[PDB]
Enzyme design. Sequence first.
Site, PDB file in Angstrom:
ATOM      1  N   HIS A  99     -36.984 -42.008 -23.915  1.00 40.94           N
ATOM      2  CA  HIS A  99     -38.169 -42.662 -22.893  1.00 40.94           C
ATOM      3  C   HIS A  99     -38.684 -43.351 -23.276  1.00 40.94           C
ATOM      4  CE1 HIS A  99     -41.862 -41.169 -25.326  1.00 40.94           C
ATOM      5  NE2 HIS A  99     -41.524 -41.878 -25.915  1.00 40.94           N
ATOM      6  N   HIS A 142     -47.880 -45.490 -24.821  1.00 39.68           N
ATOM      7  CA  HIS A 142     -47.910 -47.000 -25.852  1.00 39.68           C
ATOM      8  C   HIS A 142     -48.718 -48.175 -25.671  1.00 39.68           C
ATOM      9  CE1 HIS A 142     -44.278 -44.626 -24.616  1.00 39.68           C
ATOM     10  NE2 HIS A 142     -43.893 -44.986 -25.924  1.00 39.68           N
ATOM     11  N   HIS A 159     -34.413 -45.207 -33.165  1.00 45.80           N
ATOM     12  CA  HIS A 159     -35.218 -47.063 -33.177  1.00 45.80           C
ATOM     13  C   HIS A 159     -36.041 -47.227 -33.841  1.00 45.80           C
ATOM     14  CE1 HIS A 159     -37.765 -44.239 -30.724  1.00 45.80           C
ATOM     15  NE2 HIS A 159     -38.391 -45.778 -30.275  1.00 45.80           N
ATOM     16  N   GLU A 210     -41.433 -39.998 -33.251  1.00 46.52           N
ATOM     17  CA  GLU A 210     -41.916 -39.794 -31.960  1.00 46.52           C
ATOM     18  C   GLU A 210     -41.038 -38.342 -31.833  1.00 46.52           C
ATOM     19  OE1 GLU A 210     -42.136 -42.157 -28.600  1.00 46.52           O
ATOM     20  OE2 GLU A 210     -39.991 -42.282 -28.469  1.00 46.52           O
TER      21      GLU A 210
HETATM   22  O1  LIG Z   1     -36.653 -51.283 -26.155  1.00 46.63           O
HETATM   23  C1  LIG Z   1     -36.494 -50.271 -26.218  1.00 46.63           C
HETATM   24  O2  LIG Z   1     -35.569 -49.574 -26.322  1.00 46.63           O
HETATM   25  C2  LIG Z   1     -37.878 -49.199 -26.234  1.00 46.63           C
HETATM   26  C3  LIG Z   1     -38.818 -49.871 -26.136  1.00 46.63           C
HETATM   27  C4  LIG Z   1     -40.109 -48.946 -25.865  1.00 46.63           C
HETATM   28  O3  LIG Z   1     -41.240 -49.887 -25.970  1.00 46.63           O
HETATM   29  C5  LIG Z   1     -39.664 -48.037 -26.620  1.00 46.63           C
HETATM   30  O4  LIG Z   1     -40.539 -47.310 -26.241  1.00 46.63           O
HETATM   31  C6  LIG Z   1     -39.541 -47.237 -26.841  1.00 46.63           C
HETATM   32  O5  LIG Z   1     -38.378 -46.032 -26.530  1.00 46.63           O
HETATM   33  C7  LIG Z   1     -37.719 -47.574 -27.096  1.00 46.63           C
HETATM   34 FE   LIG Z   2     -43.136 -43.092 -27.738  1.00 52.82          FE
END
Ligand SMILES: O=C(O)c1cc(O)c(O)c(O)c1
Ligand SMILES: [Fe+3]
Lengths: 405, 408
Positions: free
Chosen positions: A11, A58, A191, A238
């Site tokens: 997402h 978020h 991530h 998550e």
């Molecule tokens: O910079 C990102 O790739 C990124 C940013 C976010 O706010 C996020 O929730 C995510 O799952 C990835």
């Molecule tokens: Fe998230």
Amino acid sequence: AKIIGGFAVSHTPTIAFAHDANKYDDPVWAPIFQGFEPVKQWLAEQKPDVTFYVYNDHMTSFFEHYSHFALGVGEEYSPADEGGGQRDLPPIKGDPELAKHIAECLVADEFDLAYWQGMGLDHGAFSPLSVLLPHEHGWPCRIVPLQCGVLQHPIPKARRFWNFGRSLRRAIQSYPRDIKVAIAGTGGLSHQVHGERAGFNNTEWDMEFMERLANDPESLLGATVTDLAKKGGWEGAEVVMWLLMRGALSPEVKTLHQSYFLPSMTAIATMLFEDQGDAAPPAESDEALRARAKRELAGVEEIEGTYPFTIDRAVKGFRINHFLHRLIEPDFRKRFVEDPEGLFAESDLTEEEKSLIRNRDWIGMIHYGVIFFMLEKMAAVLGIGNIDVYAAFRGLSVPEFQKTR
Amino acid sequence: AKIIGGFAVSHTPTIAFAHDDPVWAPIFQGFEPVKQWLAEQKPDVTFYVYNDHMTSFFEHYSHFALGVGEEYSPADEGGGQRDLPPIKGDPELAKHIAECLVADEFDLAYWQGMGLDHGAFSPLSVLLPHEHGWPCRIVPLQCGVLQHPIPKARRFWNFGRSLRRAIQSYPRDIKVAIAGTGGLSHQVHGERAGFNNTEWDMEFMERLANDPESLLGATVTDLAKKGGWEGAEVVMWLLMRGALSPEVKTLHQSYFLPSMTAIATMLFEDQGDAAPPAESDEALRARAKRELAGVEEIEGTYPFTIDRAVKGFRINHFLHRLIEPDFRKRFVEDPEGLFAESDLTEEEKSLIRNRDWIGMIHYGVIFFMLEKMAAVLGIGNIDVYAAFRGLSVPEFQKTRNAAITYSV
Ligand SMILES: O=C(O)c1cc(O)c(O)c(O)c1
Ligand SMILES: [Fe+3]
Ligand SMILES: [Fe+3]
């Protein structure tokens, strides 16, 4: 009553961003959109009536008050503001009834919930939905969003997310209405987007985790936050939300699709799961479950002058209750009293709701779906006093009523 | 780490929309024995169970909203902030309590910086001397009883049950009282408005104190019929009694039914469990730290636990308003005039003014508030990441497979 299957998809706001920028021609983004194509088309063929949509918010619509399993019971949802204004997307519709049936079965199964309406959906929802569903009119299906509090620890345990998905199947299956439901689990994969470790990914873990989610999900239920954030990054943990969706599908599933791309911070991944039904009649029948879900409110009908505040009622009453809730804001009653018609004309109450307030129609508002604590507020703004509100509820007046003490 | 026992008490607002007379004198006199037990038993903290009456909790409504914040002001209920001193919370006890509850598979909610309504402030302005502050600290468990479905009584009970061993396992021997504040029998809505039942009220109070497991089968219906619709909120009382010893000692009990609401009161004293608990309160502590154990071995990572949420709350809340278009308008045009009116300490302001990304993470800002601040400012996520990494944007983009930029 019928779960067709479920999909898993990242997402990242980059998804929303690459779509809105229309970079479907872009070298980097092109093959990634082609990665959503099997899910986009499956959803366009199978045509589910509702998508039960697991995601996290978020720190946009959830912050000062932050809950674990928060079930959207509202009739419709709009893109939220994230500091750059709402995206150019139409509101997607809800399913208060299906939300209501799921609510009931989950409480029976001893899950403590939370219910919410009116509040926007941020990239957690509208980033992938914008790319999986066509929308230059209105969305093709409805949604019952389930927003998960995965950002402020302690959060539910991995096994608790899974077990949630387990009850979630039986509820949705026991919905006595003839509908196709899909189940979405959004977020991940690897991530980390904060601190000196930001940038972290783990393609190997991502692949191992997806394969285990598909074919041996119970093997993940011992996973701690430490485990999932060591192998996958802090915000990569998550993915427990993926365990939840997986828990709502048949024990075995046909993994029709899997894609993976890691352009930037986030491993952008996609799974499609075809439900394979019930290879065995359930341990508690559909009928028995509908019983046990209604059990706590079984009979309640046979109690006069009683209008319980169930979820249907709350949705029915949300505009009037929200307006009357605004009374606690000082400036509100400085136009609810000085200039009540101006507040009215500038509001979104139906005219019937305005006449109910206007006539101080106390029991008429209780009949309509106004909660009394919203009246408690109303009676202590312009007038009025509780003995008055309590008397009109039986058509008596203050003196005749006062004769019980 | 020591539960001194706790009390059950009504929380009607007329004990303050009036109060602050000869009808009242024997009502107050129902409360003053407990009041003196609260200035003599000397509690450091009060785990106070109540329900918001659709003031603070509404558009988003939770079943067990643990208050984690460091301070609570009284909620405006339509008639102004009721002149009381801000009472102190106990985040560290809230945090630890949250940890045990999640381990026992209870799904929670956490909140900070919203008023407490009459559901708390009112009956406490009777049990607690509150000249320029309050005797103890509070852990407010706002419960969700007003919108069905709601948790079964057996679930309210087990919560309190688990909550007991969770307070006993707090490593700090302080004094904790418990306060399931509800009811009693009444009904403040409908053609049924004015209903009571003093012959259930007495059966209920007696069973709760002396055979409380005989209430774990009560449905909402059984409870609503036998006591009113709103009366069925006494399911909160089962939580408080849940968190006490099996055998207690009903020290005191009063009962006065003036108008609409039956005003009750119960003083319990905790004894001590049958033998030790099945889970040692050090092995419990272990099980409650299990999920985040060894997380400190992860580098460059700052988990967003309750203590950090509490520490970050002002700057997080302030940044959160960047979603409000009229706030963020100012923040670009008139930053300092915004800073002045805000309740941000000088360092918080500086962190923002200097765009100290790495500083804000360390300090307790959750990243998702910086994602907005980047957007508001026209830069994007990447610039923040590079900054976290002490690298230039091109140098950081090198660490990625492709070079993409994005915002919002
Ligand atoms: O910079 C990102 O790739 C990124 C940013 C976010 O706010 C996020 O929730 C995510 O799952 C990835
Ligand atoms: Fe998230
Ligand atoms: Fe109440």
